[PDB]
Amino acid sequence: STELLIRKLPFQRLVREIAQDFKTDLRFQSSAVMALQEASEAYLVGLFEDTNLCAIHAKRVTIMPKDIQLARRIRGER
């Protein structure tokens, strides 16, 4: 059940920082932070797959931000 992608302490402290922009006295469940972490890791791993293809299309091994932006644009994220 163990997965080392984003570290647990720096992830929590970022979720805690982002929630502060929206509301004070917010507490998270251990389960809630774990849900957002699996979600973020799954989104980014999946987007890294799609950006990888965009590079290959431009016939490159080295991934560039133009590939991240394309992948996101086709998904309808911009």
Binding site: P10, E17, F48, E49, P65
Partner: protein, 78 residues
């Protein structure tokens, strides 16, 4: 507190490694950080809203699942 910098250069390589990525540009680190910030902001804002409507200050794992499904993501486990 700048906790986006907590999505370190090691963690970005580990996600790209898992993404099948062979090589990576330098500009990717600050690009990937931005893509995460935006996804986390949009998912947390929606989650915080469900917390508010259910008249509590505790973010549950299901407030995260409802926020994700609205933002087009479906996490298995719930």
């Amino acid at each position: 507190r700048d906790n986006i910098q907590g999505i370190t250069k090691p963690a970005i390589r580990r996600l790209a490694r898992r993404g099948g990525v062979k090589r990576i540009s330098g500009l990717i680190y600050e690009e990937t950080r931005g893509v995460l910030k935006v996804f986390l902001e949009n998912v947390i804002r929606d989650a915080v809203t469900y917390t508010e409507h259910a008249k509590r200050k505790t973010v549950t794992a299901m407030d995260v699942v409802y926020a994700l499904k609205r933002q087009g993501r479906t996490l298995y486990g719930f």
